[PDB]
Amino acid sequence: ARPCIPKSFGYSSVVCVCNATYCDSFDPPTFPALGTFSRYESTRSGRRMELSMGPIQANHTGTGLLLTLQPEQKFQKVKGFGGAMTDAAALNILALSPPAQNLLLKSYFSEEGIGYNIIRVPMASCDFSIRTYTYADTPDDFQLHNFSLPEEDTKLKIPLIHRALQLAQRPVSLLASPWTSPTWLKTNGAVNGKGSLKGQPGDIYHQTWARYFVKFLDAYAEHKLQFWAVTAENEPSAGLLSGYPFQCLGFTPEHQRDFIARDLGPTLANSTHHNVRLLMLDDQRLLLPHWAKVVLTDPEAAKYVHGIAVHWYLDFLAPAKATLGETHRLFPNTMLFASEACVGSKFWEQSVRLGSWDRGMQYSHSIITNLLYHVVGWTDWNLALNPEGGPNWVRNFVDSPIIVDITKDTFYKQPMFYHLGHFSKFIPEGSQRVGLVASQKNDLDAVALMHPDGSAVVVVLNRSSKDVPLTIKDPAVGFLETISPGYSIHTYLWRRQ
Numbered sequence: 001a002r003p004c005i006p007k008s009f010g011y012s013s014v015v016c017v018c019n020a021t022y023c024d025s026f027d028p029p030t031f032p033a034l035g036t037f038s039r040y041e042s043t044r045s046g047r048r049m050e051l052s053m054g055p056i057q058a059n060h061t062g063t064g065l066l067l068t069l070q071p072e073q074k075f076q077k078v079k080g081f082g083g084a085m086t087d088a089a090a091l092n093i094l095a096l097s098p099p100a101q102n103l104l105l106k107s108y109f110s111e112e113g114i115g116y117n118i119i120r121v122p123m124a125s126c127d128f129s130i131r132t133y134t135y136a137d138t139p140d141d142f143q144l145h146n147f148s149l150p151e152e153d154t155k156l157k158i159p160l161i162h163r164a165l166q167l168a169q170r171p172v173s174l175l176a177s178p179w180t181s182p183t184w185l186k187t188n189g190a191v192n193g194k195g196s197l198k199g200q201p202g203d204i205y206h207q208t209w210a211r212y213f214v215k216f217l218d219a220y221a222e223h224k225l226q227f228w229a230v231t232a233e234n235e236p237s238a239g240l241l242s243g244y245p246f247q248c249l250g251f252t253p254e255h256q257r258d259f260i261a262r263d264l265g266p267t268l269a270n271s272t273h274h275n276v277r278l279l280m281l282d283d284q285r286l287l288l289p290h291w292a293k294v295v296l297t298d299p300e301a302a303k304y305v306h307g308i309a310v311h312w313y314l315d316f317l318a319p320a321k322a323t324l325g326e327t328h329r330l331f332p333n334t335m336l337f338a339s340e341a342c343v344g345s346k347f348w349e350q351s352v353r354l355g356s357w358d359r360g361m362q363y364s365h366s367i368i369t370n371l372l373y374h375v376v377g378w379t380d381w382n383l384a385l386n387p388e389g390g391p392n393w394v395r396n397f398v399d400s401p402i403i404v405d406i407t408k409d410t411f412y413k414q415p416m417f418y419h420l421g422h423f424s425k426f427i428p429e430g431s432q433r434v435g436l437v438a439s440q441k442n443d444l445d446a447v448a449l450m451h452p453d454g455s456a457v458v459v460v461l462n463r464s465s466k467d468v469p470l471t472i473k474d475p476a477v478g479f480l481e482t483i484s485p486g487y488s489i490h491t492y493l494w495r496r497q
């Protein structure tokens with residue numbers, strides 16, 4: 001293990017500083033023996049996923065807060081956690097020295113870091129690109145003979161993904177998402193602005209667009225990468241807006257329904273990539289449940305859709321029960337998945353706030369909210385950005401859990417990184433969320449899950465300034481006596497019976 005080297009930039013907490021010779025890291029993961037729990041603690045005062053242990057006790061007394069695990073009340077199974085290998089993240093990572101690159105990738109993908117098992121991969125350029133391109137920019141190439149991957153993929157993204165896979169002991173799953181089509185498929189002939197595919201689902205334009213997804217998967221398969229899933233379009237609502245500033249492709253829900261039913265579903269089903277899952281929406285939750293209703297009540301579309309991808313803009317408020325809750329009630333067998341989340345996108349907010357505990361609390365509170373509303377996974381946006389929150393060709397800068405400073409061959413691990421790791425590190429694929437019942441009203445946020453091997457994990461977030469003593473009861477095993485400090489996050493793990 002190596003501890004955090006903390007540094008303050010004047011915000012409410014610290015970053016951890018890593019460089020060519022040093023980065024904070026855990027020992028190889030082990031469970032305590034039966035009758036012992038593990039606690040990992042991060043605090044605004046500066047502790048960073050520090051490990052301690054304690055006894056699981058037979059007895060409890062107190063009129064104090066009790067959280068009783070409900071191990072047989074089962075909810076959703078968890079796919080996992082990760083982030084996006086955008087052009088911007090790739091450029092930032094590779095701008096570091098080989099040693100620092102490796103320490104950064106270990107931070108995310110190894111068991112000595114926080115055990116990410118998902119990578120989202122843009123299909124060609126987005127806002128977090130320095131060059132606007134698609135994979136088929138030569139016009140009127142409807143059979144896509146000139147489809148090809150540029151160096152952004154072959155030289156930057158693909159090799160980095162291979163390095164992450166090499167470092168991971170968990171199976172890693174890839175998710176692909178497109179922002180724009182070739183401009184010659186679009187009503188407006190530009191990568192951005194208000195514009196959709198030309199024509200109608202079922203026709204030459206739509207069939208070519210669906211063939212583009214298969215060409216993409218074929219091209220990554222030549223580089224020995226297979227995908228778990230694709231989304232039908234990144235933020236399809238964006239392309240319906242005039243002046244939309246960057247790469248987009250507009251679909252109404254009826255348009256996406258018909259595209260999925262007539263072109264994309266059948267094309268993927270008829271390909272070698274038929275096991276790839278298809279996720280709809282890939283957009284903000286206030287589009288739910290309407291979008292789900294429109295697509296999933298058509299059986300020809302419904303039979304191709306595996307899940308609903310949702311985006312989390314953490315700077316903005318939106319209802320969870322009326323969106324995610326209602327969608328789960330209407331469509332309980334269609335999984336919900338968070339495919340993108342980001343903070344600092346407001347123009348008047350500093351894009352990168354080095355050491356912001358508040359932005360850390362936003363990430364963990366959002367993840368907890370997601371897990372409590374049946375969501376099976378959570379995917380961060382850019383894996384790494386520069387101190388400006390870029391590069392970004394339209395200056396749409398945002399924050400990232402890892403900030404690269406090339407001038408110092410240094411990178412900074414944000415509170416966001418630890419808040420997310422409190423989950424990613426300790427919830428393997430196939431974990432199932434279970435119930436957790438509070439004995440009284442309280443200010444804490446918390447979630448409980450059961451590992452595939454039966455082991456318990458509980459995450460507790462305290463967004464208040466007050467230390468809250470509490471007890472966790474596992475009816476089959478005993479009691480954890482603990483405390484949730486003001487401005488802290490804890491993960492608890494123990495073996496059961």
Ligand SMILES: *[C@@H]1O[C@H](CO)[C@@H](O[C@@H]2O[C@H](CO)[C@@H](O[C@@H]3O[C@H](CO)[C@@H](O)[C@H](O)[C@H]3NC(C)=O)[C@H](O)[C@H]2NC(C)=O)[C@H](O)[C@H]1NC(C)=O
Pocket residue numbers: 005018019020021022
């Ligand atoms: C990558 O980061 C490492 C950790 O910051 C650097 O290693 C540290 O270099 C420091 C300067 O030589 C060492 O001395 C301590 O520096 C601090 C201020 O940074 C002072 O307060 C201390 O007084 C001083 N030590 C003592 C005994 O007083 C650190 O000890 C050393 N840390 C470790 C863990 O080795 C690397 O130099 C840096 N690498 C590169 C390539 O830049």
Ligand SMILES: Cc1ccc(S(=O)(=O)NC[C@H](C)N)cc1
Pocket residue numbers: 320368369372441442443444445446447
């Ligand atoms: C959206 C949502 C998040 C967290 C929760 S909680 O963890 O149940 N805490 C609520 C209370 C503060 N004690 C419930 C709902």
Ligand SMILES: *[C@@H]1O[C@H](CO)[C@@H](O)[C@H](O)[C@H]1NC(C)=O
Pocket residue numbers: 058059
């Ligand atoms: C728990 O409570 C029982 C009953 O009062 C007591 O006899 C015992 O010493 C305590 N501890 C254990 C480990 O059972």
Ligand SMILES: [K+]
Pocket residue numbers: 134135136137138146147148149
């Ligand atoms: K090309």
Ligand SMILES: [K+]
Pocket residue numbers: 344345346347348349350351397398
């Ligand atoms: K900003």
